[PDB]
Design a protein around this ligand. Structure first.
Ligand SMILES: *[C@@H]1O[C@H](CO)[C@@H](O)[C@H](O)[C@H]1NC(C)=O
Lengths: 50, 48
């Protein structure tokens, strides 16, 4: 699963089956690391109008 | 693909099913690849 975003430590309590998480709009906002089983939020990199 | 979803609930009702909501978590994803049309559950006897 490729992407680009800021990875932050997550406050979500994923259940054991659950691997990746979807937000209000059904985009992948949280992921479980395959090596250390921790949950990380994926906020997108800042977007601005110049 | 044979999917087993399971849930255990502490209940105290005597006869019928309790009325409530309980979501079943996925337990086993099983790769069998066979035809299933009929099933039968297994019970245990008590001998004295
Ligand atoms: C290897 O990955 C498993 C989960 O996939 C994890 O429990 C274990 O701690 C990992 N070991 C190392 C040395 O990273």
């Amino acid at each position: 699963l490729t992407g680009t975003g800021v990875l932050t430590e997550s406050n979500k309590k994923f259940l054991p089956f659950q691997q990746f998480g979807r937000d209000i709009a059904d985009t992948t906002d949280a992921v479980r690391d395959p090596q250390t089983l921790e949950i990380l939020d994926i906020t997108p990199c800042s977007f601005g109008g110049v | 693909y044979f999917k087993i979803y399971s849930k255990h609930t502490p209940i105290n009702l005597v006869r019928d099913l309790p009325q409530g909501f309980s979501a079943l978590e996925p337990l086993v994803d099983l790769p069998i690849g066979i035809n299933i049309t009929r099933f039968q559950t297994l019970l245990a006897l008590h001998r004295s």
